[PDB]
Swiss-Prot record:
GO molecular function terms noted in the UniProt entry: calcium ion binding; molecular function inhibitor activity; potassium channel inhibitor activity; protease binding; serine-type endopeptidase inhibitor activity; sulfate binding; zymogen binding
GO biological process: negative regulation of platelet aggregation; negative regulation of serine-type endopeptidase activity; negative regulation of thrombin-activated receptor signaling pathway; trypsinogen activation
Site entry (Reactive bond for trypsin), positions: K15, A16
Origin: domain of life: Eukaryota
Keywords on record: Disulfide bond, Pharmaceutical, Protease inhibitor, Secreted, Serine protease inhibitor, Signal
Subcellular location: Secreted
Organism classification: Eukaryota, Metazoa, Chordata, Craniata, Vertebrata
Protein name per Swiss-Prot or TrEMBL: Pancreatic trypsin inhibitor
Start and end residues of each BPTI/Kunitz inhibitor domain: 5-55
Full-protein interval shown: 36 to 93 of 100
Length: 58
């Protein structure tokens, strides 16, 4: 799978509370994390499905 699927979730420096999904390489599934509103990294999806297609899909 893409290398970014292995990266930890990144909240970033902004102060919003936006629920996003990240692929947790250890657990093997997409979990929610709190994104701050700016400077998102690639392991950040708006739905579990987008997250699964990118990283868990097989």
């Amino acid at each position: 799978r893409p290398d970014f699927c292995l990266e930890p979730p990144y909240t970033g420096p902004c102060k919003a509370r936006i629920i996003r999904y990240f692929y947790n390489a250890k657990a093997g599934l997409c979990q929610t994390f709190v994104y701050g509103g700016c400077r998102a990294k690639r392991n950040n999806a708006k739905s579990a499905e987008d997250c699964m297609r990118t990283c868990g899909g097989a």
